[PDB]
Structures are given as C-alpha cells and as structure tokens.
C-alpha cells in the first residue's frame, strides 16, 4: 500500500486526507476491472509482437530515407506490420497525416466520388469532420459536398445503441449510398462508446443490404481497448492518429489507415495525388519511433484507461456523476465528469495542468477559441504536442459543466494528477 | 588555368587531351555568360537575405516541432520568408509534399471545382501530371476529371513561344475556364523554357479576357534563373519542389507554393482537409535545412546552370546538337544533348554515373518504366535534380537531359568524364 | 486470468501446458512482491514529476541546439532535473557519452591525479572497466595506471556484504587513497546487488577514516529500484548509461553523472577538455527523448524488474537455481539462472531471441569474443542498439552455465519471452 | 556588373556611394587573385570526389545508428573517406567533439604521457588551449601539466617565420620532447598563417633531430586552402573543427583528426576511454550532413576566402591596416583589420551581425567566452551556432583593436556583409 513517504510527498501538493481515503476506497473497488484489462493487454502485446516477427523486422528497418523515399523498406514494412495487427489486406502509416481528422478526410475523399452519398450511423460526427463533409457550412474550402458528394445521418437510439432498423431502411431507400461511417469514440457525447460487438452488428446489417458498401470506422481512441479491432468484425477501412493510443506515447506525429487494398490505395491518392499514392514519401528518420510506439501501444493504452477508471470511481465516490461508470465495458480512453458547477470544473482542470510534467506552471483558463461560441478550458502539458495519450483535460464552459479527461503515459502519473485536481474541490 | 596535377589526376578517369582542348575552348567561349549569371546571383542573394532579415529569423526558429505543430514559428516564419522572396501575399512550404507533382496537384485540386475547366497553354504537361488531371486514361484513382473538372490544351507555336491568339480564342469560347496552367520548364522535349517576359505576356493576355482567371505556374527548375519570378509578373500562384533549385542542395524533401492568400489557403485544404489547411503539421526536425537550403539556393542554382552552359558549349564544339545554346537566356537548369547514336547516349550517361559521389560504382543501363529509359543518379538526397544527374528515353534521335551540380567543379568533372567515353 | 485466445496463440510458439502450470503458480507466488514494487514506483514517479515541475520544464526546453551548444536551456535544465531527482548539487547528462563505461571512466580520470589511488570495494569491477583502470592490460592506450594512478581492491565477504573492517584497514594504511569505487550491480557474481543500506554502510565507514575520500557509485541497472539512490546516502558521485533503466527505453544513447559540483565539473573536463567542460556540447535534437525517457523510467524499470521476478520464480519452480530469489530485495534488474547444462543454456537464449520484436529470426549461437577463452552467447533484438532495458540475455559458455536475463519494456513482453524460452527446455 | 536594382536595394541598407565605389575599385584590383583560387578548388573538388568513390559511398552509408553504434558503416566509411582526402593511414571524425579545442586536446592527452614534453613552435598557442596545457593557470581541472606532461615553447621569428635553428637547439637539449605542436592559423595575432611549405620546413627540421617526434598540426581554417594538407608534408596528426571549413557550412557540430593509425587510436581513447576508443558512438542521424559538407567544403572554403581577399582590399583602400594583403599567399580564411579605434571596431562587428541571415537584429557585445582571457565581441548570425565558415567577425577588446573576419557561405553574402559593415564606419 502507499508508502508513508509518498503520503508526505503528496501533502506538499495539498492532497488532503479526505481525498486520500477516497483514493484508497476507489483503488480497492476497481481492482477486478484492472485484472480484466491486464488479460486483454496480454493478448494485444502478443498480437503486436507476432506482427513484428511475421514481418521479420530488423535493425535495417530503422531507415532514414530522404527525397522521394523510393524503396524505403522501413516505411513499407511498417505498413505491413499494421496490416498484420489489424488483420487487413493493406495499411498506410505516414508521418505526413497532420492529425486524425486528416486521416479520416483522406479516407472519405479517397473513397467517395461525385453522386455518391456517405451515411454516418452514430449520429453527428465530431465537430472537426463537419467542415470536411460540408454538413452545415460550406465556404469553398472544398468539402465533400462541394465535390458533389452527399451526406446522410442516422442517430443512435435513446439507449446509445445503433438504430439497425433505420440504417436498413435508409440504405434500401438510397442506392447512391456507397459508404457507411462509424465513429467508435463518443467524443463529447454523454453516452457509451460503441463496443466491438456493436460495430459488428452495424457492418452485418449494412452488408446484408448491399455487400459492396464500404464500412469505414474512425478508430481514434479505441486501439487496444479489446482483443479485436473493427477490421476483425467486417470493417473495410479504419483510420486513426499516431499521437493517440497507437503511437504508445512516443510516435511524434502522423496517422494510419488499415483495410482492403482498394480502399487504402484510393486513400493514398488523396494523401498525395493520383499516379503517386504511397509510392513516394520519405520518413524523416522517425520510423523507429513509430515501430517502438506500436510495440508499446497495448501497454500504454491500458495505463491511460486505468487512469480513466480510477477517475470514474473516485469522482463518483466524491458525489459527481460520471460517464462511463468504473465497471462498464469501454471502447475508448475518455472519461467524462459532470461538475454541475463552473468553478469546480475550472479548478479541476487547473489542477490537472499543475499535475503535468510539461508547462505545469502555465495559465489554465477559459478562452475564446476559433468558432466555438462557448469558451473552452484545456489542460495540456505533453512531450508530444496535442497528444491524447498523455494526461489532459478539456471542457466547454457551459451547462451542466462537464469535463473530459484522457491519457496518462503511466497510471501513477494519471493518478497523481487526479489527486491534485480533486483536492482543489474536495477537502 | 587547370593545374598539371589536376590533369594527371583526370587522366586516371580516362580523360584525354582531345577532351581537354575542347574544354579549354568552351571555357573561353562561355565567360561573358558566366558574368551575366553572377549579376543575377548577386541580386537574388540580397533578396533572400532581406527576406530572412525582415522576418527576424533567429536560432529560435530552428524549432523542435512535434504533434499538431499548432503555432510552430519555424514553419510559419519560413512561409513568410518565401512570400517575401516571391513577393506574394502568402506561401505554403511543407516537408509533407512528397514531390513536385504533389505540390502542383494540390494547387489544381485546391483551386478547381466541378464544372470548371483548366487550360494548359504550353502544350501537354509533363507526363506525371497526366494521371492527376485524368488526361488520357482514368482508373478511378480520383483524377480531376473524375471529380468533374475539365481539361483543355493550347500548344506552343512552332517557334516555341506562346500562342497568345489561340489562348484568347479558347478562353473567349469557353467561359467555364477558371484556371490557366503555365509550365516554365521544358520537360522531355526540344524547345527553350519560358522566359519571365513570356510568362508575363501569357498572364496579361489571359487577364485581359477575364481578370478572374487564376494564372498558375509550375516553377520547377526555374528558381533564381532571373531576378524576377513568375509571381513578379502577375502569376496568382506558383508551385515547386524543395529537392530542385530552391532547396539549395540540402532540403531533404518537400514542396512549396507562393501566391495569393485565397489560392494558398485553397491549396492547403487539399494538402490536409477543409477546416485544417496549413494550421497543423509539425516539421519533422528538418526546418533548419529548409531555411539554409533557401539561403544557398541563389548560389547553388547558378553552379548547376554554369554546368549546363559548359555542357552546352563543349558538346556543341564536340559536334553534337545541343538545346539550348551556350549563349541563350535560360529559364531552367536543364541541358539537352542530341547524340544521334544510342551507344554514345548510353556511354555518356554511364560517364555521369561514374562521376557521382554516391553510387559511382552502380550499373547504369536502360530499364523498362513504351520505350526504355536510362538514368544517371548518385545523390545525397534521393531523386534531387539540383545534384548532378542525367536521364534519357531510349529512342531516336537519342537525346539526353543533363541537370544539376552542387558545385560547378563537380558538374565540370562529370562532363569531362562523360565526354571522354565518346571523344577519344 | 489468461484468455483462452492467448493460450491458443501461445501454443503457436510451442508453449506447452507444463510451462503454463509453472507460470500460473509463479504468478500466484509473486503478486505480493509486485505490490511492493508498485509502492516504490509510485514514489519514484512523483519524485521525477516533482523534479520537472521545480525546473518549470516547458516545450521551450525541447531544444535543437547546434554548433557549440552555448546556452542550450534544454540540456542545462535536464542536468538540473537529474540533480533534483538524485538530490545532488549538480549533474552532467549528455548524449556524448558512448556507453556506461565511458561515463564511469570520465568520473575516474576526472577525479584522479598522478599519485592518487582508487579502491574498488566490491571485488573486481566488471570486465570492460579493466582496460580503463589498467588492471590487466597496459598497451599504452592511456589507462589510469599509465597516468600514475594506482588501483587497489577489497573483495566482498563470503556472505556478499562489504568487508567494512578490511576497507578501514586498507584506507588507514594507504593515505594516497582518494576515491572509493562501489559497483552497485553484480556482474558475473553469483551474489546479490548491493542494497542502498549496504552502500550507506560503505560511505559511513569511508568518511569516518577521511571525510575527503570521494565515494563513487557505478549506478548502472539500479536506477529506480528503491525510493532512494546512492546520492541519498552520501555518495559524492554516481554514473550511469541512458540506454539502461534511466532512459526509460527511449533515450537513444548517452550517459549521466550526478554528484557534488566539484566532482561533476572535474568529470566534465575529461568528457571534453579543461577550460571548456560541459559549457560546449550541442545535443542533436535528442533532448526531448531524454526528458521523456526519464519521465517513463520509474515505470519501465519496474516492468523489467517484474519480468526478472517472474523469471526467478518460474525457473526455480522448473528446478533451476536462481539468483536472486523472487522475494529478495533487489538493487538491479538482472536475473541469473544456473542451468548446469550447456545445451539448456543455449536453448534458453535461443528462445529469448525468438521472443524479440527485432531480429527474432537471427541465429543465436555461441561466438568467439576478442580476448576471451570462453565463448559467449547473446540474445538481443532491440529498438535501441545494446539497450539493457529491452529484453535480452547473455551468458559466457562455462560451467556451471549461468545465463543473465534483463529488460522488458513491458512485463507482458518479458513474460512472453520467458514462456517461449522455458518451453524449449521444459516439455 | 552590379545591377542597378541591386544598387538601389543596397541603398535601403544605408550603403553609400563612397562604399560602393570602394567596392567597385577593390573588385577590379583583386580579380586576378581569384583565378589562382579556382585552379586549387578544382583539384580539391576532384580529390574529395575521388575519396568518396574509392570508398564506394552509397545511400546505405546515410545511417541512423542508435545506442552503442556498433558496426556503423556510415561512421566508419566517413573516417575512411577523410583518411583518403588527407592521405593518412587513419582518421577520427565524430559529432561527439564539442568544438575544435576538444579535438586538439584529445590529440594531446591521447598522445602524451607523464614525463613527456610537448613543444609549441609557433609561439603561444590559441587562447583556449592554455587551460588544456596548463601553461599559466592550474586549478585542478586536469591539465596536461597536472598529469605530469611538460610544455615548452619556441616563438616565431620577428618576420613571422619559423625559427628552425632555435627549434633544433631546444629539441637537441631536451630528449624528453616527444611531440611538436604547430598552429597553422594565426588565431588572435598579427602575422600570416603558416603555408604548407613552412609546415614542411618545420617537420623536416624536427624529424632530422629525432624521427620519433610526433608532428601535430592544428589545421583549423586551413582546409582546402592549397592542394596539399599538412599530412602531405609529413604531419603525423592533424585536427580541426567540423563547423569551420571542412564541414562545408552544413556539418552541425563535431571534429576530425587525420593521421597515423597509432596517433588516431590514442586520440580515440581520450575521446572515450581505453578499451573502447572509436568502436562505440552512434551518430545521432547527422552523418549524411557530414558527408555532404565535406563534398561542398572545397567550394565553400573558397567562397569564404574570396570574401577575405575582398575585405582585405576594400578596407585597405578605405584607409585601415590589414593583415594579410589582398595579394599574399593565404593558408587560412581569416582576414585581420587593425582599426586603432575601439569604436570603429565594435561598430564594424555590429555591422557584420546586421549583415547576417540569422539573428540579424541581435546587437552583439563583448562577452566572457569559454576559453579566453579578455572579453571578445563576436558577430555570429548563423544557421549553425558559432560556425566560422559562415560570415562572422570576432575581436578581443584591447589595443590596437584588431577585428578578425572569416566565413561566407557564398562570396555574395560575404560581400553584402562587408558593405553593410563598412558603411557604418565610412560615409
Ligand atoms: C588556430 C585555432 N586553433 C583551434 C581552434 C578551435 O576553436 P574552437 O574550440 O572554437 O572550435 C580555432 C583556431 O582558429
């Protein structure tokens, strides 16, 4: 149990006895969930190891390609390793994707053509994808809508599960629909992420209407949450970011897609241009970090999830509503806390900032950010800028004052920040 | 003049006295042209220095940049430096462009929309752009044509200059034309590159028909050939590769665009996606090389060009037809030599290969890529055109295209090694 | 517990039921030791976090210095962070150290002068240090001995503890002794690493004869094994390698020293030259990885230690003699196994090679090492070449056939490797 | 000639007609001196190309080694290329040398042992070497003197030439002298740099007394000034900085030595430790820039020298004493200007900073630079910090107020900077 020396050290952070008791109770309560996670982690570590070994990765794959990067074996074998991990025909892993949204956008523009319609089946996509699609606003930035590609949407049911009957009806009534988009993570929605079994039910439902419909999954935040990925239950294409789970906290930028050879090649032509695709693109010497990040990903992903589960339990014990609960099956690393008080939300986030190794001294306050209307507060202090796998928090400043917390390179770090933050509002 | 020690050293590369006499004559003949280049180089060096200074570039700009790269001053200031050099509202310089074709394609998809038509006014664009446009064939890769964007073409007059009369006709007769594509370099052809004055006449001509038509120039190989760039004579947007002239021999990958804020932003949305544009994108630890490459570019571009000029004159003196001539105004660093003999063309390329610092020893032979191609290449940066290289499709009349040379001495050495394999 | 999917996947590596039974028993036995390690890790994570926060580390410290490296705040602050972690006046952390031996040699040549004598109090130091000192070979390479600096040695007692009485006797009789060398880790010794309390007893004993005697500790493999470091119990100077524990699996090269300002400055003059010391030395843009490595070090060190503890117990249960035993206090991450059979030793190492992500397919056979009459066999397949914190094994091919196993970026990886290896010798 | 647009652009830097006319006159006067330089540059370019080709350099040599760097072909082949360029048995080219003083000091400590005496034959060495040797001051930093290695000095003659008769007398009278140190460049003096023929005369003289005396040359700033290097006229060992000539303006840090295998090995054991030497040492991903820099060095070295010659003649015409004159044979890239006025001096250096691409707005001032007695002002607006192959100027603050100008990646840049600087003092 916690050392007396550690207790004294935490007192210098103003962590009080009431918070320590809540922590001891929460740790005791969540032990069985941690064991479930360790069983999954064990399988995923083996899965990833096997993929490296099947590709015969060697020292020589730590390339330092320049120029066109023709024949960069490090890049080509990393794609192969990912495709093995995800059990897909192909993959496309590049530092050139600037963020996860870029990878998703490349998938969409890559696989859609004028006259086609895409169908999002988990309600409204996260905000940044809205400009990519041209859902509401269009200002000639060149959205899907501006290239004659249409958008439709089926919301999740009241219970948070996909509306399979409506999905079928919408597909049957519109034969122009060639792509179904499934967001795995909840985003800022007060509901559960979709479980792998839910993604399967969706794909089976879609494929039963027209087998040729491409089932695309935004896999961000869901890597290594289960022993299966969406590609193990019928997904034709998935996309994600290398500064979230799959980079293991160390890939410095980039993104990935895994799926059928056709979907990947089509995506590659949007990443670069038709006729080039993924054949060109040197990797700036960062390929070693991308291999290593993948190898560490199953473990680091669970450190962060463990942080989320402790957060869920401890905040519940402190009297705050939380989503998800500590014992629910999770499909992402995000934890939401309803403070129901603006000041508590602000102080909690400030606490998280002070618990960061980087920029721990920085002003953490509400600010107006481009196109949000409501102010936003963000705690971030990472080794890799914008990394979601490193402890961070964000919240719109509006009723009922919900904060979203994610990451933690280690469970001990996430725990420490959580204790600092909670001590700012519970004493 | 050439030291006796150098001559004896060159003898070890089988360089003979006949080749040395041709070299001597060529050097005498091309000195006035070198002086002309030096006057341009001096101005361009100042222009680039001033762009750095106006942007107050400092050591702090050689930033460690990771993740999203939100607020990356290294990247942001480099865009501002390029905008100053080219005298444009904005610029987009990124290591994320995998090659020059990506930069050009990004400009075209970025600035065209369904129903618009683009017009290429220097005949058909270089080959790799054909799949991007969807010119001849289409296999659902997502070409401009597959997104409802149309393509038209006006060829250069038989004298190599723009057909202004036909451009006007085609524009007046098709109001759906919203962009005019101008290729500055010659490509695998046999004509002069377009001079800045020629570019200006095309722009003035086009804007006189409809002032809203975007005039886009593929500037590859043309950087620092003149004291003006196409953006100085009305181009709305230009694109290029950082492993050609503008990288100064040291930028390791990437491309650039310079132009109006609207055109540059639209391009950025194709580079990434609508709503992100150029706001995200870390620079991978290579930003210092990109800045330093720019600073050296005016100088290095002329080392390569002097190489081309010497090549032109010595091969002319050797008895071959060369394009362009040693004393013509140039708008690119490429030199063509017509061998009228397959073996002489092959040997020459093998000579260039053996004159490279990297992969000097590698077999240089024709390979399949309709006709076979042969390429001499041995560079620090893979595929760099500013480093000494040669390529030639194997077909009548056996024309080779030579370009690059980090230093004039290196280009010279390669030329003398190559010519010695055929003039004995 | 272990999923059925995991058991079937492991069956593909020829892992058998007897090995899985041994495994389940060993996991049951070691859970209390793992909890003790978690308590120490929690403290150390906080210690490192605190060191970052006190130095107000920001993204601005992730420098990309060039040339002379004058005023490189990234490098300077990293030294300050390490000094806080080790509670020393100063520290010298540089990528310029090519390995741990270099760092140790810099300390010795830095702090010794003609006529001085150094005393190693833990028996003979590991082999690579012999040429530095000039113990056996003196071929004008410029050893301490070739510079007029003498060497004396005091072996450990039969029980493996320091011979305090003999240390005093030798120090009293030889007033030229100005530095005492203490090796924390064991080497080829079938004995335990020295505990922090043992190091304290040596320092107390030495300072009580002459307070000015420099007490120097080779800290390799010992970082974060305890909540205290040798500098917390009076060591004047310590040295280590960044591709061992303290680089957290991600530092790409380099070494560190931490200690009094005088000792560190004197070391810096050997690293470079007198009058320059640590004032020049750009850091190639690898400083971020060094900071992140340190931050992950408390956690990664314990992933490796958990693999060593598992190895100890499962091998003991398999019938092999092991050093240390699963429940002894540890001062390093190394686990020794006495096979008493050349073939089993070789098969075990082959197994570890087949469980690596990198070079899993390369032949692992004994080979002739320059200047040694016993062949050596080594299993190695790392992201960072030569890293001791990634799973690896090595053995000199001699009776009684003892292998040394260390590393494991994640406990799951070390575990997988051990299971693959044991299955090659226990059916 | 200069374009009118260029003249108008220059007027925006407050460059006046008097300075432009001085420039025009100077260029006319020095043109013939440049022809000589191009003949040398041509040979040197071929010399370097040949060395690359003999070593069969390929893209495979652009290594990205990590950890120990064992078996790094990029590093090993670069040493071989250097050795061919300098016509020596061996070479040691490493990013690990922090500056040129480090490389020189490693040579001396590497090759001298207690009882040996070194003899500097060009008068007092460059400032930063005084602490390395222990000439005057000794504060237990570990100078040669503190390790029992003695120092003697023979000054140059009043005419600046080597005093061969005195060298002979000193060597004959002291058989403990085992190394002769020869400085090629003048440092902060007022004399001409030693030509290759002067270096030969010293080597022949020394070897005629005792063939076993190591002839060591500090080659900084002299690389590619002639078709020969000191190793072509009998030097056993030479050393220099990769941020001066031989780095070609792109090597980011480091040093080199070239010479006999025995002298290079002995230096390597000081750079690291005995028993390791040059066998360990990963190269931080910068090896490609070191190869590329060497290839550009013959050219860039002459761009800087053309700048020095222009500076000589334009300042002479302006009315200042200069050393050397525009038409003297040069053995380094440095140009000295005696202002005999502290104000004109600091103003000139400030002009140079304002003529630089990087940090043009920083107003440079005198500072306590590591390794110097008095305060020196340095103009150093560079891509690589402290690089003196990039346009720079430095000047100890003391009578007669001599400024030392060197560098220029292009002659056009050196020209522009000289005009900017002179315009601040001449109107
Ligand atoms: C003569 C001379 N020696 C040595 C050096 C090395 O100086 P630094 O340590 O600044 O690289 C410079 C120099 O000009």
PDB file of N, CA, C and O in Angstrom, chain B residues 284-304:
ATOM      1  N   UNK B 284       9.039  17.845 -38.551  1.00  0.00           N
ATOM      2  CA  UNK B 284       9.913  16.673 -38.538  1.00  0.00           C
ATOM      3  C   UNK B 284      11.395  16.857 -38.238  1.00  0.00           C
ATOM      4  O   UNK B 284      12.172  15.943 -38.504  1.00  0.00           O
ATOM      5  N   UNK B 285      11.807  17.999 -37.700  1.00  0.00           N
ATOM      6  CA  UNK B 285      13.223  18.198 -37.412  1.00  0.00           C
ATOM      7  C   UNK B 285      14.087  18.631 -38.593  1.00  0.00           C
ATOM      8  O   UNK B 285      15.306  18.755 -38.443  1.00  0.00           O
ATOM      9  N   UNK B 286      13.475  18.921 -39.749  1.00  0.00           N
ATOM     10  CA  UNK B 286      14.229  19.333 -40.928  1.00  0.00           C
ATOM     11  C   UNK B 286      14.054  20.798 -41.289  1.00  0.00           C
ATOM     12  O   UNK B 286      14.466  21.201 -42.372  1.00  0.00           O
ATOM     13  N   UNK B 287      13.446  21.605 -40.426  1.00  0.00           N
ATOM     14  CA  UNK B 287      13.180  23.006 -40.807  1.00  0.00           C
ATOM     15  C   UNK B 287      14.461  23.818 -41.009  1.00  0.00           C
ATOM     16  O   UNK B 287      14.536  24.640 -41.914  1.00  0.00           O
ATOM     17  N   UNK B 288      15.483  23.583 -40.187  1.00  0.00           N
ATOM     18  CA  UNK B 288      16.735  24.321 -40.370  1.00  0.00           C
ATOM     19  C   UNK B 288      17.307  24.105 -41.785  1.00  0.00           C
ATOM     20  O   UNK B 288      17.743  25.066 -42.441  1.00  0.00           O
ATOM     21  N   UNK B 289      17.271  22.863 -42.277  1.00  0.00           N
ATOM     22  CA  UNK B 289      17.769  22.551 -43.615  1.00  0.00           C
ATOM     23  C   UNK B 289      16.986  23.271 -44.701  1.00  0.00           C
ATOM     24  O   UNK B 289      17.537  23.582 -45.768  1.00  0.00           O
ATOM     25  N   UNK B 290      15.692  23.496 -44.452  1.00  0.00           N
ATOM     26  CA  UNK B 290      14.841  24.164 -45.438  1.00  0.00           C
ATOM     27  C   UNK B 290      15.188  25.629 -45.511  1.00  0.00           C
ATOM     28  O   UNK B 290      15.301  26.176 -46.598  1.00  0.00           O
ATOM     29  N   UNK B 291      15.389  26.258 -44.350  1.00  0.00           N
ATOM     30  CA  UNK B 291      15.843  27.650 -44.312  1.00  0.00           C
ATOM     31  C   UNK B 291      17.228  27.770 -44.958  1.00  0.00           C
ATOM     32  O   UNK B 291      17.451  28.600 -45.829  1.00  0.00           O
ATOM     33  N   UNK B 292      18.163  26.931 -44.534  1.00  0.00           N
ATOM     34  CA  UNK B 292      19.525  27.028 -45.041  1.00  0.00           C
ATOM     35  C   UNK B 292      19.600  26.753 -46.561  1.00  0.00           C
ATOM     36  O   UNK B 292      20.318  27.441 -47.279  1.00  0.00           O
ATOM     37  N   UNK B 293      18.816  25.788 -47.035  1.00  0.00           N
ATOM     38  CA  UNK B 293      18.713  25.491 -48.456  1.00  0.00           C
ATOM     39  C   UNK B 293      18.246  26.706 -49.246  1.00  0.00           C
ATOM     40  O   UNK B 293      18.786  27.010 -50.316  1.00  0.00           O
ATOM     41  N   UNK B 294      17.252  27.423 -48.719  1.00  0.00           N
ATOM     42  CA  UNK B 294      16.785  28.648 -49.384  1.00  0.00           C
ATOM     43  C   UNK B 294      17.923  29.647 -49.482  1.00  0.00           C
ATOM     44  O   UNK B 294      18.152  30.227 -50.528  1.00  0.00           O
ATOM     45  N   UNK B 295      18.635  29.844 -48.388  1.00  0.00           N
ATOM     46  CA  UNK B 295      19.701  30.847 -48.369  1.00  0.00           C
ATOM     47  C   UNK B 295      20.810  30.565 -49.389  1.00  0.00           C
ATOM     48  O   UNK B 295      21.367  31.492 -49.990  1.00  0.00           O
ATOM     49  N   UNK B 296      21.131  29.281 -49.557  1.00  0.00           N
ATOM     50  CA  UNK B 296      22.131  28.852 -50.519  1.00  0.00           C
ATOM     51  C   UNK B 296      21.636  28.716 -51.956  1.00  0.00           C
ATOM     52  O   UNK B 296      22.445  28.643 -52.871  1.00  0.00           O
ATOM     53  N   UNK B 297      20.323  28.656 -52.141  1.00  0.00           N
ATOM     54  CA  UNK B 297      19.691  28.406 -53.429  1.00  0.00           C
ATOM     55  C   UNK B 297      20.083  29.329 -54.567  1.00  0.00           C
ATOM     56  O   UNK B 297      20.348  28.856 -55.674  1.00  0.00           O
ATOM     57  N   UNK B 298      20.153  30.643 -54.318  1.00  0.00           N
ATOM     58  CA  UNK B 298      20.560  31.503 -55.435  1.00  0.00           C
ATOM     59  C   UNK B 298      21.941  31.151 -55.973  1.00  0.00           C
ATOM     60  O   UNK B 298      22.171  31.228 -57.173  1.00  0.00           O
ATOM     61  N   UNK B 299      22.851  30.800 -55.074  1.00  0.00           N
ATOM     62  CA  UNK B 299      24.204  30.412 -55.446  1.00  0.00           C
ATOM     63  C   UNK B 299      24.242  29.033 -56.103  1.00  0.00           C
ATOM     64  O   UNK B 299      24.743  28.889 -57.221  1.00  0.00           O
ATOM     65  N   UNK B 300      23.676  28.040 -55.425  1.00  0.00           N
ATOM     66  CA  UNK B 300      23.706  26.673 -55.940  1.00  0.00           C
ATOM     67  C   UNK B 300      22.993  26.554 -57.310  1.00  0.00           C
ATOM     68  O   UNK B 300      23.460  25.826 -58.176  1.00  0.00           O
ATOM     69  N   UNK B 301      21.895  27.283 -57.505  1.00  0.00           N
ATOM     70  CA  UNK B 301      21.150  27.224 -58.774  1.00  0.00           C
ATOM     71  C   UNK B 301      22.056  27.625 -59.929  1.00  0.00           C
ATOM     72  O   UNK B 301      21.997  27.036 -61.012  1.00  0.00           O
ATOM     73  N   UNK B 302      22.894  28.637 -59.699  1.00  0.00           N
ATOM     74  CA  UNK B 302      23.844  29.089 -60.726  1.00  0.00           C
ATOM     75  C   UNK B 302      25.030  28.125 -60.904  1.00  0.00           C
ATOM     76  O   UNK B 302      25.557  28.024 -62.020  1.00  0.00           O
ATOM     77  N   UNK B 303      25.449  27.400 -59.850  1.00  0.00           N
ATOM     78  CA  UNK B 303      26.512  26.387 -60.041  1.00  0.00           C
ATOM     79  C   UNK B 303      26.020  25.342 -61.057  1.00  0.00           C
ATOM     80  O   UNK B 303      26.736  24.984 -62.006  1.00  0.00           O
ATOM     81  N   UNK B 304      24.770  24.905 -60.881  1.00  0.00           N
ATOM     82  CA  UNK B 304      24.169  23.936 -61.786  1.00  0.00           C
ATOM     83  C   UNK B 304      24.043  24.538 -63.192  1.00  0.00           C
ATOM     84  O   UNK B 304      24.377  23.890 -64.182  1.00  0.00           O
TER      85      UNK B 304
END
